[PDB]
Design a protein around this ligand. Sequence first.
Ligand SMILES: [Mg+2]
Ligand SMILES: [Mg+2]
Ligand SMILES: [Mg+2]
Ligand SMILES: [Mg+2]
Ligand SMILES: [Mg+2]
Ligand SMILES: [Mg+2]
Ligand SMILES: [Mg+2]
Ligand SMILES: [Mg+2]
Ligand SMILES: [Mg+2]
Ligand SMILES: [Mg+2]
Ligand SMILES: [Mg+2]
Ligand SMILES: [Mg+2]
Ligand SMILES: [Mg+2]
Ligand SMILES: [Mg+2]
Ligand SMILES: [Mg+2]
Ligand SMILES: [Mg+2]
Ligand SMILES: [Mg+2]
Ligand SMILES: [Mg+2]
Ligand SMILES: [Mg+2]
Ligand SMILES: [Mg+2]
Ligand SMILES: [Mg+2]
Ligand SMILES: [Mg+2]
Ligand SMILES: [Mg+2]
Ligand SMILES: [Mg+2]
Ligand SMILES: [Mg+2]
Ligand SMILES: [Mg+2]
Ligand SMILES: [Mg+2]
Ligand SMILES: [Mg+2]
Ligand SMILES: [Mg+2]
Ligand SMILES: [Mg+2]
Ligand SMILES: [Mg+2]
Ligand SMILES: [Mg+2]
Ligand SMILES: [Mg+2]
Ligand SMILES: [Mg+2]
Ligand SMILES: [Mg+2]
Ligand SMILES: [Mg+2]
Ligand SMILES: [Mg+2]
Lengths: 129, 14
Amino acid sequence: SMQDPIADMLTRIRNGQAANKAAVTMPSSKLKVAIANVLKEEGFIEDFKVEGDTKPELELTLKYFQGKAVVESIQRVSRPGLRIYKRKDELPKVMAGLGIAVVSTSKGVMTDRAARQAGLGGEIICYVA
Amino acid sequence: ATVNQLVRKPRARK
RNA sequence: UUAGCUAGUAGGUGGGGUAACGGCUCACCUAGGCGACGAUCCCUAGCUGGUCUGAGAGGAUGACCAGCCACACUGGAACUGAGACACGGUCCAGACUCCUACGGGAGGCAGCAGUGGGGAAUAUUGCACAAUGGGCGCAAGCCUGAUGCAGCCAUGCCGCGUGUAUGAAGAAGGCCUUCGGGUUGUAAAGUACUUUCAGCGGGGAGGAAGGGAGUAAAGUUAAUACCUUUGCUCAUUGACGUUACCCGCAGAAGAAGCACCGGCUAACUCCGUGCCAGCAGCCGCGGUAAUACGGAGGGUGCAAGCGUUAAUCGGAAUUACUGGGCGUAAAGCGCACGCAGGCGGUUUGUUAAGUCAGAUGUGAAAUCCCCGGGCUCAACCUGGGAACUGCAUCUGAUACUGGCAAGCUUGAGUCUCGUAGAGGGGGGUAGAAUUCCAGGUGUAGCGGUGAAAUGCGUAGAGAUCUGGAGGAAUACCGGUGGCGAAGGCGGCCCCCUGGACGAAGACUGACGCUCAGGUGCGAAAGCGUGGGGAGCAAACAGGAUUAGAUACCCUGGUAGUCCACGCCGUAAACGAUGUCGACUUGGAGGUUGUGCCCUUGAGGCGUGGCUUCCGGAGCUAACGCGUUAAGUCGACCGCCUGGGGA
RNA sequence: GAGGGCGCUUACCACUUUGUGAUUCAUGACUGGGGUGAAGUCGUAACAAGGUAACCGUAGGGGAACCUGCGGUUGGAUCA
Ligand SMILES: [Mg+2]
Ligand SMILES: [Mg+2]
Ligand SMILES: [Mg+2]
Ligand SMILES: [Mg+2]
Ligand SMILES: [Mg+2]
Ligand SMILES: [Mg+2]
Ligand SMILES: [Mg+2]
Ligand SMILES: [Mg+2]
Ligand SMILES: [Mg+2]
Ligand SMILES: [Mg+2]
Ligand SMILES: [Mg+2]
Ligand SMILES: [Mg+2]
Ligand SMILES: [Mg+2]
Ligand SMILES: [Mg+2]
Ligand SMILES: [Mg+2]
Ligand SMILES: [Mg+2]
Ligand SMILES: [Mg+2]
Ligand SMILES: [Mg+2]
Ligand SMILES: [Mg+2]
Ligand SMILES: [Mg+2]
Ligand SMILES: [Mg+2]
Ligand SMILES: [Mg+2]
Ligand SMILES: [Mg+2]
Ligand SMILES: [Mg+2]
Ligand SMILES: [Mg+2]
Ligand SMILES: [Mg+2]
Ligand SMILES: [Mg+2]
Ligand SMILES: [Mg+2]
Ligand SMILES: [Mg+2]
Ligand SMILES: [Mg+2]
Ligand SMILES: [Mg+2]
Ligand SMILES: [Mg+2]
Ligand SMILES: [Mg+2]
Ligand SMILES: [Mg+2]
Ligand SMILES: [Mg+2]
Ligand SMILES: [Mg+2]
Ligand SMILES: [Mg+2]
């Protein structure tokens, strides 16, 4: 059903980005905040707010160029049907280093560019292309 | 198509 | 198209047993063991370090080298010995051959070659202990078909030569030719230069260290003997070997072929032949003009090799993890329930299981890769490093996944009030129509077709009216209308009973999704037993049609259609779309509710459930789909791999 | 005397014999289809509304292509 909520999060981002929507809403969680705040610090989105404490509702502000999609495509890599893990030197790049790869480690959620100074590996979340 | 289907039986090489 | 296997089997006591633990063996005791994470059975196969292919992931295989296990004519057994159940040890049996005076014995080439035979196909019945390794011995020495070598086999890889400089009316010849000219063609000849290798003569490193005889020092010892070790000196140790190498000689003298030439794929003309012959990997060439056949001319690609056949991978993303599809190209089980299995909302703590970080140990050498060195070069040999992405352990980090603990409510459920519906089963009941039967009035055709006939009827058909019997179906309502998981489901009424949906809240707290085997439902035909019988109607009867009519058409007609009781489980069982959830512009409507509103009309405004037709973005092979997806995604399952065989 | 050897006997057991099974190859009268066949015979089924719309499933029929019965579908023309 909603068994991969991160893949449900990537579905709601990719649709409203392409369909010229100004802002989207989604059910919040701890892990969804730990991904959207990284995308806010990497220039892909604008802002996020939390609403509700018994039903946590996350909101995302979209971002455009001249009415053109900033996030052109995003790819869920690991999934509950097949888990993907890499080491500190087998971290894949997106568009040969242009896009970022969201990898959550013990030192929080960071990119593979940020995992060079950290020297860790773990679960690949999404290819932000 | 499903990876979990190939756990039971792999792709049958002719 | 293998689902149950197993009684010394699984475990325990005690005795015995080997070098060691142990059903390894024996009595007793228990009834367990193994197994849908493949037990067991059948077939096949030595495995690994690797080689080859491939960008990689993968793929196919295990020759030479190295590691291990098994085996030594077949089968079984023990001795010996530290080590064997023993390749050239023994014993017994069987098989085969040999010797024999007939009673008997002898033998194991899968050791080196070599013969016979098999097969497309794989070698001399060679030399040596010079070196290395091993065996014995104090050493000398001996032995070694290990190994070092040699020969054969273009069998593979790599290197070199078969000349070079110069030489145009550019000769001849061949072929093409619009006979003007081009081609072969600086190519040949001739003019100059030179000798890689082979041939012929000479010299000649290294593979060799030792070992053996004198001798000094040191050592112990009663000892300057003997011996041990370190020195020095003398004479020696090469199968390959006519060694590599090098000097010298003579002269281009001794040293180039095969395949192709339509496209793929490098190169174009001519003649001969006539869908014949032939060619061919594919496409398909050739019956009167064939660059594709045969030959010639000329060229191309290779090269001491060149082609062909067979085999492996690549190309092939053509078993798609990387990296494929399933509406119609092959493919979504007919549908539903559900175990095992996979997967799982949200908050916090804990464990550190998975994962990640660091470190140790290990991953034999050789092969591959990096930089070197060496053989005149290369192949080849080789130094160190990297690689071997592996496995085990310790110390760490806690975001995610897993486990535990406490939760939370939007997921999924529970109650109440309600509304709609051909949902199913059972029991009654109604009225037309069909046919049969009874009666009445009534007369010559009824019936049927394109046209006729079979058939029915003067016993009065048909038609009409009255009355009764039986059987099955439900006009109109009724409509891309409703309901059900689906096939499907339709007069009305009662009874029993199922799900779906909406409103207001209350409440449990992930209770969920999905499904291989298993389980049930599942159109009609048909099958079993016993009823039932109008109408329709396989086979069949009969008449037209016709070449024949078996079919069509018509008049009849059994099985069946109906019910009970089972079985059968297949359909174009189709939305030709498996289920569930999350999102993404919209209209025309339908159906079913609910909330509010000058109720100011069955209306206005919203808002859920179900459903059809259009259509944007997007997707798609096209058709079309397009908030009910075939758009973008997740969870899980089924299924397909050229057509035919099937 | 102790002890050993020989001999005999017993346990285990290869080969070997009968009875009777399971499995595999070769041979195999006969027999079941199917494929490959441009011109052979027999017919005209299907593709158009292919001249009785076609097709799927099922029962029956007959040299055969096929036909009829029941039910389903549009992968059917014409349509109102
Ligand atoms: Mg014991
Ligand atoms: Mg050898
Ligand atoms: Mg070996
Ligand atoms: Mg042995
Ligand atoms: Mg033996
Ligand atoms: Mg021998
Ligand atoms: Mg031999
Ligand atoms: Mg032979
Ligand atoms: Mg000439
Ligand atoms: Mg020479
Ligand atoms: Mg010497
Ligand atoms: Mg060409
Ligand atoms: Mg030829
Ligand atoms: Mg000709
Ligand atoms: Mg060569
Ligand atoms: Mg082949
Ligand atoms: Mg492939
Ligand atoms: Mg494909
Ligand atoms: Mg198809
Ligand atoms: Mg279906
Ligand atoms: Mg190694
Ligand atoms: Mg090394
Ligand atoms: Mg090396
Ligand atoms: Mg060199
Ligand atoms: Mg009636
Ligand atoms: Mg509560
Ligand atoms: Mg019957
Ligand atoms: Mg008839
Ligand atoms: Mg019956
Ligand atoms: Mg079927
Ligand atoms: Mg359709
Ligand atoms: Mg459009
Ligand atoms: Mg549409
Ligand atoms: Mg096939
Ligand atoms: Mg026909
Ligand atoms: Mg027809
Ligand atoms: Mg029909």
